Amino acid sequence: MSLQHEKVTIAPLVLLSALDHYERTQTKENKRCVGVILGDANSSTIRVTNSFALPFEEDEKNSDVWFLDHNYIENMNEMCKKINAKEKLIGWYHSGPKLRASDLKINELFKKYTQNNPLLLIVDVKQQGVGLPTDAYVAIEQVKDDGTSTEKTFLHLPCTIEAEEAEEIGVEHLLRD
Amino acid sequence: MQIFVKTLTGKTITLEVESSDTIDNVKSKIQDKEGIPPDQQRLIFAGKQLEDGRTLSDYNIQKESTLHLVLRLRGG
Amino acid sequence: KETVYISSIALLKMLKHGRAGVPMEVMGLMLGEFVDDYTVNVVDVFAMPQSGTGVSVEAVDDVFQAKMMDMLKQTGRDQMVVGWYHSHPGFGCWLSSVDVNTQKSFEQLNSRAVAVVVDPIQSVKGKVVIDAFRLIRHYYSLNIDYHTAKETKMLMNLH
Ligand SMILES: [Zn+2]
Known part of the structure; x- marks a missing residue:
C-alpha cells in the first residue's frame, strides 16, 4: 500500500566521515x-x-x-x-548544503552499484541551523497527473542520528567538557 | 642499479641491487640498513606481493623502480 | 610530556571495530602526523583483512594495506602511518610479547611510532579503556587526549 522506505538513521561516524572528507580535500565553500x-x-x-x-x-x-x-x-x-x-553499498553523499541540478544524473550512476533504489544523503558540513544537518532523498519516477507523462524526482525521507553502543560511548567520551 | 623502497610511514629507503637477485635476498638486503627481520617483511610491487623464491627478472623490476614495504601485523 | 591526540573518527573507528570483533581481537593501522616532539596526531585508522581469536590477531592481506594508502591520498588524506592498534577484549591495555615484536619493527622505521590498545569489553559509558605505548624491551604509556568546533557541533546532534 505504501512505499517501503519511510525513515533513515545515520551513524555519527558517517557524519564525521563526511566532515573529515570535506576538510581534508580543503573544499572551497562553493565546492x-x-x-x-x-x-x-x-x-x-x-x-x-x-x-x-x-x-x-x-x-x-x-x-x-x-x-x-x-x-x-x-x-x-x-x-x-x-x-x-x-x-552494503546503499547510495551516496555530498556536502550540500542542498540538492544540486546534477544530483539526479549522478544518482542514476549509483543505481548500478546498489541492490535497491539508491539513497542520497546530504551532510551540511557548515552546520547552519538548528535541526539535523542531514537530508535524505531517494529518486522515484512519478506519473504526473498528465496522466501518461512521468517526472523523475527526489523523494525526501526524514532523518535521525542513531548510534550503536560503541559509537555512543565514543561520542559521550568526546563530549567530555 | 639504484632502486627505492618507500614505507607506509613516509620514510623512504634507497637500495643498490642487480636484476639477478631473489626476493628472499632482497629482504635480507633491507634488514642491513634498518634492522627488520626478513620474516617480518612483505614486499609489494605493481599490486603483487613478491614471493621469496623468484628474482627481479621474474617481476621485471628495473632501475629506479619503487617497491613498497608492508610489515607483518601480529597482535596478541 | 608527549601526547597522542586521537581524532574523533579515529576513536569511533577503533571502538566500533573493537566491539564488532568481540569475542575476537581486531587490529588496524593508524594514520597521522608527528607535529612536534611532544605531539602525535592520529587523524585516521583502517582495518585490513585479518584473522583473530579471543587472544590473538594477525593481518592476512598485505596488498590491501598498500592499496588502501593510495586510495586515501587520492581523496585528500595525505597522512602516513604513525602506528597501529589492536584490541584486548576483556583483559585491559598493555603490550604483550607478540605486540613488542611488532612494535619494535614499527619503531625501526620511525622512532616515534605508536602502539594503541583498546579494551572493547571494559569500555562503557563514562569509561573508555584505551592506551598508547612505545618501546625503548620494556615499554611505556603515552598520555592520550582529543582535539575542533566543526566536529563538536556535529557530535551534539546525537541526542
Ligand atoms: Zn596486545
Whole structure:
C-alpha cells in the first residue's frame, strides 16, 4: 500500500566521515565533496552506518559537467566487502548544503552499484541551523497527473542520528567538557 | 642499479641491487640498513606481493623502480 | 610530556571495530602526523583483512594495506602511518610479547611510532579503556587526549 522506505538513521561516524572528507580535500565553500554510503537498506528504515570518500570534480559554473571516478567506486567497495560484508553499498553523499541540478544524473550512476533504489544523503558540513544537518532523498519516477507523462524526482525521507553502543560511548567520551 | 623502497610511514629507503637477485635476498638486503627481520617483511610491487623464491627478472623490476614495504601485523 | 591526540573518527573507528570483533581481537593501522616532539596526531585508522581469536590477531592481506594508502591520498588524506592498534577484549591495555615484536619493527622505521590498545569489553559509558605505548624491551604509556568546533557541533546532534 505504501512505499517501503519511510525513515533513515545515520551513524555519527558517517557524519564525521563526511566532515573529515570535506576538510581534508580543503573544499572551497562553493565546492562540494562526494562519496559512498554503506549500511542496510532492506527494512522500512534505511540504516546508514559507514562511508568512504570518492574522487569527484565538477564545473563551478555548469551542472551537466562533472567527473565521478567509476573505477574508484568498484575498487574501494570491494575492499570494504572483505572487511565487512554486512555494510552494503546503499547510495551516496555530498556536502550540500542542498540538492544540486546534477544530483539526479549522478544518482542514476549509483543505481548500478546498489541492490535497491539508491539513497542520497546530504551532510551540511557548515552546520547552519538548528535541526539535523542531514537530508535524505531517494529518486522515484512519478506519473504526473498528465496522466501518461512521468517526472523523475527526489523523494525526501526524514532523518535521525542513531548510534550503536560503541559509537555512543565514543561520542559521550568526546563530549567530555 | 639504484632502486627505492618507500614505507607506509613516509620514510623512504634507497637500495643498490642487480636484476639477478631473489626476493628472499632482497629482504635480507633491507634488514642491513634498518634492522627488520626478513620474516617480518612483505614486499609489494605493481599490486603483487613478491614471493621469496623468484628474482627481479621474474617481476621485471628495473632501475629506479619503487617497491613498497608492508610489515607483518601480529597482535596478541 | 608527549601526547597522542586521537581524532574523533579515529576513536569511533577503533571502538566500533573493537566491539564488532568481540569475542575476537581486531587490529588496524593508524594514520597521522608527528607535529612536534611532544605531539602525535592520529587523524585516521583502517582495518585490513585479518584473522583473530579471543587472544590473538594477525593481518592476512598485505596488498590491501598498500592499496588502501593510495586510495586515501587520492581523496585528500595525505597522512602516513604513525602506528597501529589492536584490541584486548576483556583483559585491559598493555603490550604483550607478540605486540613488542611488532612494535619494535614499527619503531625501526620511525622512532616515534605508536602502539594503541583498546579494551572493547571494559569500555562503557563514562569509561573508555584505551592506551598508547612505545618501546625503548620494556615499554611505556603515552598520555592520550582529543582535539575542533566543526566536529563538536556535529557530535551534539546525537541526542
Ligand atoms: Zn596486545
